Amino acid sequence: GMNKMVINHLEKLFVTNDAATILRELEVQHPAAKMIVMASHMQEQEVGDGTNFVLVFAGALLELAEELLRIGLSVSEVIEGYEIACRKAHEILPNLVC
Amino acid sequence: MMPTPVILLKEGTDSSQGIPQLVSNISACQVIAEAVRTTLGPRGMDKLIVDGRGKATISNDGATILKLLDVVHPAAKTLVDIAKSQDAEVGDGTTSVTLLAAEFLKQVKPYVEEGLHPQIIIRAFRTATQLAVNKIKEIAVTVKKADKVEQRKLLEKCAMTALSSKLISQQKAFFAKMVVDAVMMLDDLLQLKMIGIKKVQGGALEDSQLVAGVAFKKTFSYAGFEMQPKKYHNPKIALLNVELELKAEKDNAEIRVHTVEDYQAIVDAEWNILYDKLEKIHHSGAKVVLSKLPIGDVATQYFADRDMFCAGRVPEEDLKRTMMACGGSIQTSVNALSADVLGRCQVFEETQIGGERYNFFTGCPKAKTCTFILRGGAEQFMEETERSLHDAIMIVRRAIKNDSVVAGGGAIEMELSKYLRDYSRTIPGKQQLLIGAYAKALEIIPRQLCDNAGFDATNILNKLRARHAQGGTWYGVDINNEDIADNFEAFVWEPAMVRINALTAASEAACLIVSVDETIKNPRSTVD
Amino acid sequence: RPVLVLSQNTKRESGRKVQSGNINAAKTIADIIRTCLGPKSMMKMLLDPMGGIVMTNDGNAILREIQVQHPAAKSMIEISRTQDEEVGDGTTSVIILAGEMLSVAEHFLEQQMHPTVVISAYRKALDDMISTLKKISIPVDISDSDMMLNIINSSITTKAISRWSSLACNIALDAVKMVQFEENGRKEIDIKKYARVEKIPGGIIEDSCVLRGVMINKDVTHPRMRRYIKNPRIVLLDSSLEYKKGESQTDIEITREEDFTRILQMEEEYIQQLCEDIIQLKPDVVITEKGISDLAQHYLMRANITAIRRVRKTDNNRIARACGARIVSRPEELREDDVGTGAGLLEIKKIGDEYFTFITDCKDPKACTILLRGASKEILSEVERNLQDAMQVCRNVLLDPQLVPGGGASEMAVAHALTEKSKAMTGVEQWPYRAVAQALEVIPRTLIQNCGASTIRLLTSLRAKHTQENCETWGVNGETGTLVDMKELGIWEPLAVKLQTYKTAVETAVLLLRIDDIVSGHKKKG
Amino acid sequence: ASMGTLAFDEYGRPFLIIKDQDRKSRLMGLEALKSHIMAAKAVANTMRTSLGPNGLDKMMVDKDGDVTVTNDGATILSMMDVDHQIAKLMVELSKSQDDEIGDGTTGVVVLAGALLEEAEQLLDRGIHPIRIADGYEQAARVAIEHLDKISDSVLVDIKDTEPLIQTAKTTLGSKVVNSCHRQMAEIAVNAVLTVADMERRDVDFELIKVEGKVGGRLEDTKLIKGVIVDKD
Amino acid sequence: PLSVFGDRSTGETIRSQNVMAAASIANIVKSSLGPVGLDKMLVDDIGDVTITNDGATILKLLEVEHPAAKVLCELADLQDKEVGDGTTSVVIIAAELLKNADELVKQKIHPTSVISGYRLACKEAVRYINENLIVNTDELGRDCLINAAKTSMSSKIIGINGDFFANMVVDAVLAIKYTDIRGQPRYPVNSVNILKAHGRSQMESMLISGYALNCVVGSQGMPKRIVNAKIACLDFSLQKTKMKLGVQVVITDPEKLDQIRQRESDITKERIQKILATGANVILTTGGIDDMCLKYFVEAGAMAVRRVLKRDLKRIAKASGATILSTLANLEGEETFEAAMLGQAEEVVQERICDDELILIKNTKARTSASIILRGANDFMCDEMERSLHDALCVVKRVLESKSVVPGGGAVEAALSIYLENYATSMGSREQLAIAEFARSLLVIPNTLAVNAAQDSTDLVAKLRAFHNEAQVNPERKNLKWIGLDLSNGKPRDNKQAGVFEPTIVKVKSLKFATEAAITILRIDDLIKLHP
Ligand SMILES: Nc1ncnc2c1ncn2[C@@H]1O[C@H](COP(=O)(O)OP(=O)(O)O)[C@@H](O)[C@H]1O
Ligand SMILES: Nc1ncnc2c1ncn2[C@@H]1O[C@H](COP(=O)(O)OP(=O)(O)O)[C@@H](O)[C@H]1O
Ligand SMILES: Nc1ncnc2c1ncn2[C@@H]1O[C@H](COP(=O)(O)OP(=O)(O)O)[C@@H](O)[C@H]1O
Ligand SMILES: [Mg+2]
Ligand SMILES: [Mg+2]
Ligand SMILES: [Mg+2]
Ligand SMILES: [Mg+2]
Ligand SMILES: [Mg+2]
């Protein structure tokens, strides 16, 4: 990953590749992006690493959800499928411990 | 693009990513380096910067020039920061760090334009810098004799080399001797606060002196001060932190009396308190009384009546230096003024220096402090003299810590460049180009020296390269003869840690600049 | 005083942002008219900046009434106009197809695929699309009027005129058939010049008809002339029938007292001579594109001739084609062959509060007018647009007698054929090939969405049906939202329209995929 | 050549390094030296007409309209409202000469102006300015040694003040008090000799009170071996 | 001191500013180079959109206010006029030359030495190209022309369709070949009329075996197809006759007025009858025709076209054997038109092209002509297709005129860089450095080609340099001179075998022009900009 120079509204430099720091120093205005950022910050508080994973996975899920909505599936069906798949993934995950 | 009815980031956010922003960052670093390019070397020239208030600062120090420049480019600020870092850790080489970092970035810019991955460049810089630092540590010359004469000569030569680039370079031997004496008589921690620097207008540079003791300006004497004798031949100095004047006993104190005799008794009691403090001071046998707190006119006249000397409102640093030189102790109470807490100096004297009166404490045999008194024709003249002396003092302190010297004048860097090219000629070839670029960039300092001196840099560089290739580690630029010479035999000496820290900081700055791919600039808040 | 290598107002944008913006602009243009496709489409109201109202569901009109700033949107508008001009149908289809292909291309552009690979895959796909479309076509017997009427119907089931289907189909077919003309070994139709559509607000739409002749909004110059002639002999003209100044400067000089009266009498004699030359052919109607002098009117009424003046050149050409006359400019060179015999009735009658001239019984007329009567001007404008689409479709079928199954059947068949072909390439460009092949499913998907049925279930069923061998004519019923064989529903499309739509959509995708830089703000420098 | 650098990047995107860089100025290289030499020459040529017994005073007016007719170089340059930085350096040089010595505050400015004027033509011939400075330092050392060589010693006894009177007269010759020249020199010598520590030590100017009062004549100025108090 | 009412820049400042301007211009068009190059879209602040890849067009549309950038823009324009191809390459090469030369100057090398080194390097590069890197087209045949056209049309909107478009271009160019005096076969490109009309795809672009007019018949009564055409080309309007300025009609006896007015049109009637009596079928005039003469032509069943463009009329007359007649006046003082002044064609029709009509003069006699009708998706596509087609036509003309071609795909630059780097060691002491930097600057073309494909530019260029070094060192490995870049796979490839050719004149002229521009800009060391 490549570092990013982020200047907040106070000329405070932030050169970093930490996703949570970049999001914190970015003046995000869209509410949906705000919720994604809040999820990332919650992950940072709970665990301490994996924030960029949170953004990447959430973004991919939302683009694929848009694809599914376009082909014909309703929002409720997409949500139910995502919940079922998340449950299955959490069930699978312990078996992958090396 | 599209309006995007609800925009993601706040309006006015500026974003730049990709190769173009990296190229722009490199160009900005070049711009910053150009600001201090001509300040390097014995033929370097000073720069004048005027602030908004109108005050002018004249300096040859790279860190000072960069600080006075108000740089706001995010990538360019890294060079200012590394200049500050070099100044803090070493004290000299603040121009070399910026020149080296800018040259590294310039050398790798063509490869960046071709789309080479920045991680490869970063790895190449790290490898080259590690090798260069190891080589510097390996070939640095050190003497394991601990000879006092040899150590003093080494310190003097290092100070002269650190001084032969400033406006005081004409008196570089004089000031190097002074600086070496001051640092040697510093005791064990080499604290910079234990070396006073007094600037007095008027007089030649050679009029500047180093006091084997402490000296400070006269501090707002009261009436009756001119009746005190102004010279003593073995005074005992009472360093006090006491307000010797009639005043309210305490802030919240409140006196309640209902009888005129009690009124008179209270008045006489205040007077007796003051006179008791004064008598306790006088009976200690002291002749010079120094206080951090105001000394009133009554106390001044009392001391004048006893042929004593008083000086109130002395700055705290000056009292600390007086304590460390004469060897007493600062007392907040006068109830126990024993001989242990009294300072002692051979001669105390007040003398005029260029329209100012100074108090001199000389003859201290076990003094752990100094006082530089600098003369000159202008405020900026004394300021730049102080800056140059600070550079020399830091160099001498570092050399005291470790006597590992490398010949200057670009000799060390030419040797490093030769070594790095030899190493790079024996590796696969993706890293070979970048390490060769690093080695070529290490040639900026001798080239800048020749350019500043008005030489032909190409011929000198070719001669230096041939000489280093055929043998001779310490051949560098000879400014006076417009040729090359064995700079180790010419006593152009540099502590190795100067070059080590310079290379480390320049490499770190270059790696950080290269690693950045996107710049995001949030809109200003409260523009007002 | 900045250095300003470029001008101050010049802006540059480059990279992934440009491609994403172009593709999003195309998607937005598609989404504007997505709902205006299919038999169950809904109309839109467009407010003309001049103050008029355009109420239509034709794709080209909607896109033409919209002003956009993004140049990709301008490209899409130009694509719509090109499709309308070339074949006259499939505008919404081509816009939607271009948007879909650009979306599926953005999918690959987001990854590390160069746009040239996507463009090459698209061109190969277009070649195979053309091949399959030509393969699954069927011939048409143009002599069978019933099949032509069915084709026109299938063209106009998705327009507001679909309520009056047989009437519009017959009008369009008859107009095209009797505007068809061949001369000197060259065949032509020329719906643009002849086959005029004249709309008169009022009345009822059932009264609309195509006349075996032409009708103009003109009246006789003098009321004494006949307004109803049984079998007129029409003579057409361009030159004025009035005294005019010469080209050169021709000042006179009068010194004798009788020269003024003489000159005026010569003017009158010149008019009389022109009228006598016209009368020599014994006509009944004289039509002029320019003015007719009042004295000329008197001299013509003396010979019992109806005269009409100030007729537009296009109208006069239409009259010449309809009644078999030849326009002449010098009456002294008028010949018998130039006299228009063949018109079977001329009648000036009042419609509403205005006079209209009818030449409406021509035997074998090569030009015609279509009289539209309706509720208002906007309704008649929409009817004219629908009838223009019908005539264009009829002309396309007449030129190319190939037909293609409709209702999205052709899209699914071609998509399946390309998907089957893609299984053998085993290269890196197979993925864009398959993506652009399946992008054709946006037509049946849009038909289902507009119909209101479940998109996913119907498309899955349709794909499964098309995986069989003889199922190329299975499409989506636009009303019931059910999978029906199009040889039973009867909806068919000209092969030319489908080919033009596919070609134009693919080429638009190629053109917009090719751009990666945008510079704007520079001066015209004309 | 001025205002610094301005590129706005080769990619068109903004290229801003220093705050308010479009509002700042920059002079570099030889033309900066020429401008400085020209300013210093202007100051020195202004000052040089007030040099010697036939020097002419300068009438200085401050911001409040108060007038100061004077011949002292340090005072003239101190009251001069300059904006050029090199002129400020000249003013500081005069102040330094006044503080260290008290006399010759006009000679230093003229000497500096002459030195810079010569250095100008030296620079025009392609000599590095550091070389000029080194040569000036060498020549200054030679001149100082020569002054020490040709110097003469005088007696500073209180029983013979003639050499002291002559020195004070030479100092006062260029001032307006040359009408009372000998009396002024006499009172100055007596004042210094009265309040001084005889072992070549310092002279405390706080023990010399200089008090002025209008009226009378300039010849009425006298030295009083006591204190004159502004009270009654 | 100077007291000049303006701004002044001197020394490193102005040199670096000029380098920055040139670099900005190069970076503008650097992304549109090679087969993996991508076009740009220019918006002209009134909504006009221009989509193009041609460097000259991009640089002309852009408004520039820095004079060095103007120098590069005019350099591109000159390369376009004199060659027609390589317009981007010359700009990029000139900018890189300027960059490296300025670096040398900043290293305290005098600019005169750099200029001398650049001149020597350019001369040696041209000599080496002519001596070692040229391939004769005699042993290749029509395949060489096809491959040159295909290479030219790469990086264009018609690149993928080269298999068809190259055949079209070659046929069009060969169809207009004419031999002048000295027996030199010259090919007059720009005599091929290019007509743009949206509609069907690019595959439906038509090559007319004749000439195509963007005009229609003046009257609907005239026939729209004539089999055995007898074209009459005229350069005078056919209208009612009006006397000149110096002639004025004054009437004293009124009896003559009618005769005067009748003759005013009888003159033109007689002229029309004289023209028509020779059997003429098609009449083309640059001037206008009024309704009277239009009816005269209608009655005779003859096609008449008005407002024909002068260049189109000249081409039609030359191809069909007709003669332009500005007037009907023989050397006997009479007014006559003889049948020997008539051109001929096998068919003249008025075809319909996407709701519009144009006149096709098919299969003219006494000379073969050609025209191309480009069918696209919209106006911008057709314009870009026309520009690319013109580039291909110019390339084919250059190849047919001078029968030498050079391998493409960066082979020439790599070979030149190796040769010049070797050769610099035998010349001078500082011009050595100048020639070395010229050689290094020559490598910007393959670097840009590799970068545009998102390939490993460093390793690919290194492999190319190794191949060319082996070719120039081993006398028996000289077949490696043709190894260029195959951008599809990102690997070196024998471009001569692969058919990536291009005219030698392109490289020679581009090198000369770039050296001239770099020398011109590098000479400046001071700028005075007076306030307007
Ligand atoms: N007598 C000398 N001869 C040649 N070079 C010298 C001499 N003295 C110092 N240098 C060079 O000057 C360089 C540093 O310049 P200077 O301005 O003194 O310090 P800084 O690096 O802090 O700017 C060192 O690299 C050293 O090699
Ligand atoms: N009765 C029908 N049932 C199902 N589909 C139909 C029917 N009639 C027409 N269609 C489909 O609707 C489309 C026509 O949509 P239309 O509004 O004409 O778009 P455009 O004007 O762009 O051609 C055709 O693709 C055709 O296949
Ligand atoms: N098929 C190909 N493979 C590799 N390189 C090519 C190919 N076609 C052209 N090139 C090279 O790409 C370079 C850029 O050509 P281009 O920029 O399109 O022409 P111009 O410079 O006239 O715009 C040319 O120098 C040519 O040698
Ligand atoms: Mg992590
Ligand atoms: Mg130093
Ligand atoms: Mg339709
Ligand atoms: Mg004096
Ligand atoms: Mg080209």
- Measured distance CA(B502)–CA(B94) in Å, rounded: 8
Atom 21 in ligand 2: residue holding the nearest Cα: C90
Contact predicate C237/C328, CB 8 Å: yes
Question: Burial of B145 by CB count in 10 Å (0-12 exposed, 13-18 middle, 19+ buried)?
Answer: exposed
Chain B interface residues facing chain A, Cβ-Cβ under 8 Å?
6-10, 13, 72, 74-75, 77, 118, 512, 515-525
What backbone phi and psi angles, to 5 degrees, belong to C476?
-105, 125
Q: Which residues contact C123 (CB under 8 A, 6 or more apart)?
A: C506, C510, E160, E161
CA distances from E336 to B291, C132, C261 (A): 130, 61, 42
Question: Burial of A93 by CB count in 10 Å (0-12 exposed, 13-18 middle, 19+ buried)?
Answer: exposed
Q: Is D203 helix (H, G, I), strand (E, B) or coil?
A: coil
Instruction: Give residue B379 CA to ligand 7 midpoint distance, Å.
Output: 24
Whose atoms come closest to the Cα of D98: which ligand?
7
CA distances from A48 to A1, A55, A97, B53, D203 (A): 18, 14, 20, 48, 75
Other CB atoms closer than 10 Å to residue B515's CB: what's the count? 18
Q: Which residues contact B18 (CB under 8 A, 6 or more apart)?
A: B517, B518, C15
A33–chain B Cβ distance below 8 A for any pair = yes
- Among E151, E396, E399, which residue has the most ligand 3 atoms within 8 Å of its CB, making it the best to mutate? E151
Binding site feature residues of C for ADP: 38, 90-93, 158-159, 407, 478-479, 493, 498
- Measured distance CA(C26)–CA(C101) in Å, rounded: 10
**Helices C430-438 + C115-135 axis angle, to 10:** 50
Other CB atoms closer than 10 Å to residue D165's CB: what's the count? 16
Chain B hits for D130, Cβ within 8 Å: 42-43, 45
Q: How far is A79 from chain B (nearest CA, A)?
A: 24
Q: Which of B520, B524, B527, B528 to mutate to test the interface with A (most CBs of A within 10 A)?
A: B520
| Residue in B31, B42, B377 nearest the CB of D92 | B377
The number of C-beta contacts closer than 8 angstroms across B and D is: 88
Q: Is E121 helix (H, G, I), strand (E, B) or coil?
A: helix
Question: Burial of E290 by CB count in 10 Å (0-12 exposed, 13-18 middle, 19+ buried)?
Answer: middle
- Measured distance CA(E359)–CA(C444) in Å, rounded: 42
Q: How far is D30 from chain E (nearest CA, A)?
A: 11
Given C174, C315, C338, C389, the catalytic residue? C389
Minimal Cα distance from A73: which residue of C?
C456
> Which protein residues have their CB within 5 A of the ion that is ligand 8?
E 85
**Which strand (E) or helix (H) includes residue E195?**
strand E193-196
Q: Do D8 and C12 touch (CB under 8 A)?
A: no
- Measured distance CA(E15)–CA(E524) in Å, rounded: 7
Of B40, B162, B22, B21, residue with least CA distance to B97: B40
Tell me, what DSSP letter sits at residue E36? T
DSSP string for E321-348 = T---BS----TTS-----GGG-EEEEEE
Given B39, B57, B95, B98, the catalytic residue? B95
Tell me, what DSSP letter sits at residue B10? P
- Measured distance CA(B491)–CA(B141) in Å, rounded: 12
- Measured distance CA(E476)–CA(B431) in Å, rounded: 32
| Percent helix, strand and coil across chain B, each to the nearest 5 | 50, 20, 35
Q: How far is E5 from chain B (nearest CA, A)?
A: 26
- Measured distance CA(A38)–CA(A44) in Å, rounded: 10
Contact predicate B3/B48, CB 8 Å: no
Torsion over CA: B142, B148, B149, B151 (sign): positive
CA dihedral C276, C278, C283, C286 (to 10 degrees): -120
Q: Is B112 helix (H, G, I), strand (E, B) or coil?
A: helix
CA distances from C42 to A38, C159, D120 (A): 42, 9, 88
Atom 27 in ligand 1: residue holding the nearest Cα: B409
Residue D52 CA from chain centroid, whole number: 14
Whose atoms come closest to the Cα of B169: which ligand?
1
Pocket of ligand 1 (CB under 6 A): B 39-42, 44, 62, 92-96, 161, 164-165, 408-410, 445, 449, 477, 479, 492
- The terminus-to-terminus CA distance of chain B in angstroms comes to 31
What backbone phi and psi angles, to 5 degrees, belong to C456?
-65, -45
Work out whether strand E343-353 and strand E225-226 pair parallel, antiparallel, or are unpaired: antiparallel
Torsion over CA: E417, E422, E428, E430 (sign): positive
To the question of whether residue B169 is assigned a binding role by annotation, the answer is no
Atom 10 in ligand 2: residue holding the nearest Cα: C407
Tell me, what DSSP letter sits at residue E238? B
Instruction: Give residue C456 CA to ligand 2 midpoint distance, Å.
Output: 20
- Measured distance CA(B158)–CA(B167) in Å, rounded: 17
What backbone phi and psi angles, to 5 degrees, belong to B488?
-65, -40
- Measured distance CA(E471)–CA(E419) in Å, rounded: 10
Work out whether strand A3-7 and strand B516-521 pair parallel, antiparallel, or are unpaired: parallel
> Which protein residues have their CB within 5 A of the ion that is ligand 5?
B 92
What backbone phi and psi angles, to 5 degrees, belong to E256?
-90, -10
Chain E hits for D1, Cβ within 8 Å: 8-11, 13
Q: Which tokens belong to B81?
A: 């920061």
- Measured distance CA(B327)–CA(B318) in Å, rounded: 13
Residue A36 CA from chain centroid, whole number: 6
After which residues does chain B break, using C–N > 2.5 Å?
A: none
The residue type of C69 is Q
Of E531, E444, E525, residue with least CA distance to E68: E525
Other CB atoms closer than 10 Å to residue C456's CB: what's the count? 15
DSSP string for C474-509 = EEE-TTT--EEEHHHH--EEEHHHHHHHHHHHHHHH
What is the rounded radius of gyration, in angstroms, for the C-alpha atoms of chain A?
A: 17
What backbone phi and psi angles, to 5 degrees, belong to A13?
-70, 145
Q: Residues in chain D, how many?
A: 232
Instruction: Give residue C385 CA to ligand 6 midpoint distance, Å.
Output: 11
Q: Is E455 helix (H, G, I), strand (E, B) or coil?
A: coil
Resolution in Å, one decimal place: 2.8
Of D103, D100, D119, residue with least CA distance to D41: D119
Q: Do E377 and C327 touch (CB under 8 A)?
A: no
Of C225, C188, C223, C227, residue with least CA distance to C399: C188
Tell me, what DSSP letter sits at residue D199? T
- Measured distance CA(B231)–CA(B345) in Å, rounded: 12
Q: Is E361 left (phi over 0), alpha (psi -120 to 50) or beta?
A: beta
Q: Which tokens belong to C80?
A: 């719509």
**Which strand (E) or helix (H) includes residue B263?**
helix B260-283
Q: Is C35 a catalytic residue?
A: no
- Measured distance CA(C442)–CA(C430) in Å, rounded: 20
**Helices D162-172 + D181-194 axis angle, to 10:** 120
Chain A hits for C445, Cβ within 8 Å: 71-72
CA distances from C356 to C49, C214, C219, C284, C342 (A): 32, 10, 7, 18, 20
Q: Which residues contact E352 (CB under 8 A, 6 or more apart)?
A: C188
Contact predicate B415/B480, CB 8 Å: no
- Measured distance CA(B352)–CA(B338) in Å, rounded: 33
Instruction: Give residue C183 CA to ligand 5 midpoint distance, Å.
Output: 99
Of B217, B13, B133, B111, residue with least CA distance to B514: B111
Burial D18-49 (b: 16+ CB within 10 A, else e): beebeeeeeebeeeebeebbebbbebbebbbe
- Measured distance CA(B155)–CA(B158) in Å, rounded: 5
Q: How far is B186 from chain D (nearest CA, A)?
A: 31
Elucidation method = cryo-EM
Q: Do B9 and A28 touch (CB under 8 A)?
A: yes
The residue type of B89 is E
Chain D hits for C5, Cβ within 8 Å: 8, 10, 12
What are the residues facing C474 on neighbouring strands? C485
C320–chain E Cβ distance below 8 A for any pair = yes
Contact predicate C442/C473, CB 8 Å: no
DSSP string for E345-372 = EEEEEEEEETTEEEEEEEEESSS---EE
E70–chain C Cβ distance below 8 A for any pair = no
- Measured distance CA(D155)–CA(D161) in Å, rounded: 8
Judging contact as 3 or more Cβ pairs under 8 Å, the answer for A and E is no
Given C56, C92, C132, C501, the catalytic residue? C92
DSSP string for C78-141 = HHHHHHHHHTSS-HHHHHHHHHHHHHHHHHHHHTT--HHHHHHHHHHHHHHHHHHHHHT-B---
| Percent helix, strand and coil across chain E, each to the nearest 5 | 50, 20, 30
Question: Which chains are adjacent to chain C, needing at least 3 Cβ pairs under 8 Å?
Answer: A, B, D, E
Contact predicate B291/B314, CB 8 Å: yes
Residue C84 CA from chain centroid, whole number: 7
Of E92, E111, E225, residue with least CA distance to E520: E111
Q: Which tokens belong to E119?
A: 């001149």
Chain B hits for E454, Cβ within 8 Å: 115
Contact predicate E369/E191, CB 8 Å: yes
Q: Do C10 and D8 touch (CB under 8 A)?
A: no
Q: Which of A2, A6, A8, A22 to mutate to test the interface with B (most CBs of B within 10 A)?
A: A2
Largest Cα–Cα distance in chain A?
Answer: 48
Q: Which residues contact B60 (CB under 8 A, 6 or more apart)?
A: B39, B44, B45, B46, B47, B165, B166, B167, B384, B387, B388
D25–chain E Cβ distance below 8 A for any pair = no
Q: Do E8 and D7 touch (CB under 8 A)?
A: no
Minimal Cα distance from E21: which residue of D?
D10
- Measured distance CA(C265)–CA(C273) in Å, rounded: 12
Atom of ligand 2 nearest to the CA of C94: 22
CA dihedral E314, E320, E323, E324 (to 10 degrees): -30
